[PDB]
Amino acid sequence: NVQFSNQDGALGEPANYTQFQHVLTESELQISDAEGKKGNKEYFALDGNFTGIVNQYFYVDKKSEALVFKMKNDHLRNEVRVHKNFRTDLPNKLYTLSAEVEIIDPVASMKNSNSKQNEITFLQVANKGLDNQGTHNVPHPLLRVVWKEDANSVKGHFWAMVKNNAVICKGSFGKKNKDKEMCKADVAYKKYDLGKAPLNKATAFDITVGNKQLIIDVDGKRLVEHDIDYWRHLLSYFKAGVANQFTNGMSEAHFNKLEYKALETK
Amino acid sequence: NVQFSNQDGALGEPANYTQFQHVLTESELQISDAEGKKGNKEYFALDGNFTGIVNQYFYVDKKSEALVFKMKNDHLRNEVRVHKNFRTDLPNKLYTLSAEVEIIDPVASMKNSNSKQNEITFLQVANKGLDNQGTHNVPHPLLRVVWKEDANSVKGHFWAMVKNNAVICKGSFGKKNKDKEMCKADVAYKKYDLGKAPLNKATAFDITVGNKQLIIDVDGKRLVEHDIDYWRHLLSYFKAGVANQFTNGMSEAHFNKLEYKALETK
Numbered sequence A, B: 001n002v003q004f005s006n007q008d009g010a011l012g013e014p015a016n017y018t019q020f021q022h023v024l025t026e027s028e029l030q031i032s033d034a035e036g037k038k039g040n041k042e043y044f045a046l047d048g049n050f051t052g053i054v055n056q057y058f059y060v061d062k063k064s065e066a067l068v069f070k071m072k073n074d075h076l077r078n079e080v081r082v083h084k085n086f087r088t089d090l091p092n093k094l095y096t097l098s099a100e101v102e103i104i105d106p107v108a109s110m111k112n113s114n115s116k117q118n119e120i121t122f123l124q125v126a127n128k129g130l131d132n133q134g135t136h137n138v139p140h141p142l143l144r145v146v147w148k149e150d151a152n153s154v155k156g157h158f159w160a161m162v163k164n165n166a167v168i169c170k171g172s173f174g175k176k177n178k179d180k181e182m183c184k185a186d187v188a189y190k191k192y193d194l195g196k197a198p199l200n201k202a203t204a205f206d207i208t209v210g211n212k213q214l215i216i217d218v219d220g221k222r223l224v225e226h227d228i229d230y231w232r233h234l235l236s237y238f239k240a241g242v243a244n245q246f247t248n249g250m251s252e253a254h255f256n257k258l259e260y261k262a263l264e265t266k
């Protein structure tokens, strides 16, 4: 069971900080019990009410006012999940997630890892499926924004890992596709270098989905403008926090800013 | 297996009739061996060349110049399949199949049937899938235009059977959905009455797919204008001929007209 405690006032409660209040009301918390079963997940603030929701892994640092996410162990996660399952294909509906993030001591996080991946995912666009119930879910996110230890000798960069078709390539429903060209790592994904991650400094990310486009700005500069016509049928949603693709360590992300905005016109 | 012959000149060869040449060049023939096993199907004119393709089940009546499709037995078929796998969701791309059809003595065709369906399908909009290879095919056609013996005491009408979502509701990939509300017959399909089939007279059908609409005109009159936004990701295609959903008899359709036209602009 995941617990809540502000450690006698040491930890700030996220719902008490105006800069995070709106995104919190628009979301729920999906967090693993670090010492529970593999890949486990608990849900809180199902209604968007984060009042009282705080613990050692999810809090606001009272001095910096950063929203802090932590999690230990491979495949465990700690994320705010924005509730809207939005269409990505319409010209008059644009959905934006804006963040300023610093990943804390990621090389140390990964010291004892033997993962071949060695990534921390801190922003994501997932699909729900064809409908709000998750029918025909595709078990691949549209986007993962990650800190990656070593990508063919390029060390400590941020990357956007973009799923570049709508094909199921793993699991029970991917058996017919997994060995085809469309499921090869270099075909099913397009990767964008978002730059070397800086030390002791936050980096701004702005992700806009809509009008058949996935747009990513980094520190105010447009780096990704990717056509996602192929994803048109999939209702999609934002997550932010940490998700571990490395073993035997704890990740830690500090968000100086986390915002969500829907721009629906006409 | 399927053999070709004009019966010493008695049968007209479809490729020799100018009014059918264009649709044929744009299609292939998918036809069953009438004596073979349920569901069997053979393929001819893979390149659109129908020269020499004629037999007692697929011919032009030399007197009337009707293109004749016949087939006997349950779940056997005899259809031209138009090659283009088109998008249905774009405003500047519309795809039209136009036919004038007469179903010959269908009550006699079904005289010995024990099928609960008792339908002859003679026009169809199918999906290929997400791509030309058929990835993630949905095993349900978007549309079937049929002659139906009896639908809730309404006898001998034409119907448009329209699949009203993009959900797989049967087969190995439908197990998770098949018992849900979205797969119930009354939800998964919308049925339109296209009128009582006339005696000894052809009926015109014009099917237009594109711009997120499925339109059906019957003798010029717009009877179906259905929003197909839900099908947007599925590349789709036309078939025309006969497909039997009844047992122990022979279907026969006479097409005075069969045309295909793509209206692609910018």
Ligand SMILES: O=C(O)[C@H]1O[C@@H](O[C@H]2[C@H](O)[C@H](O)[C@H](O)O[C@@H]2C(=O)O)[C@@H](O)[C@@H](O)[C@@H]1O
Pocket: A138, A139, A140, A141, A163, A243, A245
């Ligand atoms: O397949 C990928 O692109 C990424 O999948 C991730 O696992 C998914 C998993 O398939 C489920 O959808 C689950 O709900 O979420 C996981 C996720 O991390 O979002 C990871 O395996 C990631 O490395 C893959 O690259």
